[PDB]
């Protein structure tokens with residue numbers, strides 16, 4: 127049985143904003159579901175000071191029980207909260223932080239990085255500490271790593287996480303802190319540039335899944351023409367796919383690309399590359415994401431595969 131133990135990692139982002147995590151378990155530990163007991167300690171030994179936010183996956187949410195002093199947010203590892211849930215979090219934090227100058231918010235997630243960073247950086251924007259998502263993200267990265275070099279990827283883990291902090295910035299600045307109006311869209315096309323070196327280099331290994339919040343709503347398989355029609359353009363080093371039968375989409379959308387190619391590595395989320403967007407913040411008839419704006423190609427270790435001009439564009443139709 128060698129070594130067990132409780133390793134509570136606590137990082138003061140500001141004097142009243144804490145990021146907490148438990149980096150050490152491990153495997154079979156006596157300390158199962160530590161949040162309940164950390165909460166119990168706070169309400170006993172430091173009453174009416176700390177409010178804990180527990181950020182956990184769909185599966186991990188089931189293991190939790192309601193707590194008066196704990197606010198739960200459902201977010202999958204290497205993913206983002208719904209924009210609605212992000213705004214609800216900000217509202218709850220605002221109420222807690224403003225009611226008493228001594229009040230502290232403590233944000234917890236398993237890895238103490240991507241999910242925590244998304245919410246902490248959004249909070250820093252709400253409290254006016256920074257004017258831009260980039261500044262907030264870099265600052266949190268610097269606090270959690272104790273390292274000076276400003277890197278947004280030290281603050282969060284994925285490009286969608288960076289996007290969602292940006293979404294909050296836009297909501298605060300341009301929408302009066304309110305959720306933007308619903309926008310209904312259908313995906314009618316996908317275009318991928320710099321396809322050479324990516325799987326088979328011609329799109330024939332690829333499939334695309336569209337997920338609405340947590341439910342698959344469309345699957346396209348490119349080579350086969352399953353809900354689609356693939357065209358490979360060698361002269362422009364790109365693939366374009368007509369997307370067929372897309373249902374009406376609204377709100378938070380996840381797009382995942384899968385491959386039958388052994389040579390194309392999976393990153394996070396059990397796939398080669400993926401991204402999140404919100405339909406309400408789509409401008410025009412498309413969204414185009416560059417290499418470092420896509421989840422997985424954002425990592426330098428994949429740059430021999432996803433080259434400088436690798437981009438993914440979704441083309442939309444207006445659904446009333």
Ligand SMILES: [Cl-]
Pocket residue numbers: 190191192
């Ligand atoms: Cl419950």
Ligand SMILES: [Cl-]
Pocket residue numbers: 390391392
């Ligand atoms: Cl792999």
Ligand SMILES: [Cl-]
Pocket residue numbers: 312443
């Ligand atoms: Cl239509």
